[PDB]
Ligand SMILES: [Fe+3]
């Protein structure tokens with residue numbers, strides 16, 4: 001039925017072609033202290049963000065899920081301005097990053113007060129059923145993240161909170177996996193606490209190339225995402241070549257009703273402008289919102305995937321996920 | 324001669340009685356993502372902050388150094404408003420927190436671009452010689468922090484940057500030590516890179532009770548601080564009893580020209596409001612800006628310390644430090 005976007009509630013029928021994981025705004029926790037050399041280009045950032053939405057709208061996309069966590073400069077009103085100008089639908093999130101690239105100390109401190117997991121739940125409920133700050137916007141998904149090879153104590157507080165929240169709300173859960181680890185464990189641990197696998201998207205699965213690992217995850221009946229198309233050389237991540245050679249294994253075996261695709265782009269960066277060093281800067285030349293529809297998809301056809309199947313992924317699956 | 328406060332440059336002669344370490348505003352990194360339940364009480368916070376300044380002004384304090392790091396919600400314009408209303412002098416900082424209660428990922432990421440330590444220097448120079456963001460305020464001190472028993476790789480980038488900045492500027496360095504560790508190592512590592520010990524305040528020394536350790540540190544000719552008076556029972560911290568019994572050892576042995584005192588208070592908290600749990604909330608009942616002048620000081624007299632000596636600590640030392 002209905003899904004909360006930044007422009008208030010929307011019928012899931014009208015979601016349409018959907019990218020599951022892209023950032024308009026993103027900054028690594030700590031960017032706020034580099035304000036002096038990295039002040040936020042308020043009205044140019046908006047100009048770039050609308051550039052990316054119009055760039056997405058023209059390949060038939062009607063909906064983006066933006067899972068930018070609360071500590072990476074999530075900005076729902078900004079996003080609201082973008083949708084108001086483009087008509088694109090934008091679903092935002094409620095969540096923190098993970099230990100390795102998040103902001104532990106604050107909730108670490110409350111953990112000592114004994115109230116952290118309640119506070120995270122209370123925050124999740126608030127942002128899902130009341131609205132984010134005074135923006136009036138509710139998050140449409142819960143963002144979760146785990147570390148490499150571990151779901152830390154701190155992360156588990158959020159997983160628990162997240163599972164208990166979803167039971168109270170029916171919110172979709174979207175997750176981050178670190179370097180192709182902890183897919184199954186994530187699914188397992190959320191299902192243990194009463195989350196519903198049909199309302200769960202294990203993310204960054206494209207970060208493992210052994211399809212055995214994906215199947216172990218799909219077996220929970222959760223959705224999985226290859227949401228990092230375009231990112232190469234970094235994090236130890238595999239090439240777009242590996243992804244497709246890993247993606248195709250799961251398509252012929254008819255799992256497409258559990259797979260969705262994205263790029264995990266950052267269209268505007270918070271903090272100090274930077275430019276990638278020259279080894280790095282050519283491997284990730286393809287990391288942009290165009291990448292899938294002009295490259296990844298044609299490649300998929302040449303290896304024989306029905307356009308019907310893809311529609312399950314970009315339209316059916318997301319419509320399914322949110323209902 | 325001159326020191327940069329939030330109200331522009333000021334003659335060091337007019338610093339006067341000085342608290343070396345107190346926060347008006349503070350939040351643990353991550354507080355920004357708890358915005359919905361923890362929105363910043365803009366104009367009440369200002370009302371509380373002026374309460375604390377007026378409360379400090381009446382025990383003769385004319386100057387506070389507020390070392391709130393860039394990632395813990397440092398707010399120089401806010402501070403500026405406080406001084407403009409009270410006439411108090413407020414010197415702010417340029418720094419990041421340490422790894423355990425800091426926000427590593429952002430500078431961690433730049434470390435991979437190969438430019439982090441330059442960027443930290445460039446940030447330090449900017450905030451010391453040009454101004455913080457568009458506030459026009461320059462930091463008067465550099466804030467540095469290390470972990471328990473370790474000065475991590477990440478922290479050393481900032482120490483190096485900090486030492487090279489001070490050489491270019493003459494800025495005072497103020498530091499944080501974790502649980503009474505790394506005093507000497509900090510001094511040693513800064514002196515190695517050309518920092519001047521007479522422009523350095525090793526902080527949280529009151530976190531070690533073995534005076535042997537302090538002397539090892541004082542031997543570098545750096546200043547040291549017992550800046551956590553009132554914080555008891557927490558972090559592994561020692562009682563105000565231990566501090567004084569540790570402080571007195573260094574006074575009779577005539578080091579007072581290297582010691583200064585504070586409380587390290589947080590007069591307004593960013594993030595979700597909270598009550599300290601029932602055990603904790605008793606031990607730290609004394610953690611407030613009044614604590615020193617009404618309690619710690621009388622206690623010091625009864626054990627026979629000349630008011631002249633104290634003046635070296637609250638007036639002479641700081642005046643010395645900044646010139
Ligand atoms: Fe992402």
Ligand SMILES: [Fe+3]
Nearest residue numbers: 344346390587
């Ligand atoms: Fe402090």
Ligand SMILES: [Mn+2]
Nearest residue numbers: 176177204264
């Ligand atoms: Mn991610």
Ligand SMILES: [Mn+2]
Nearest residue numbers: 499500527587
């Ligand atoms: Mn500190």
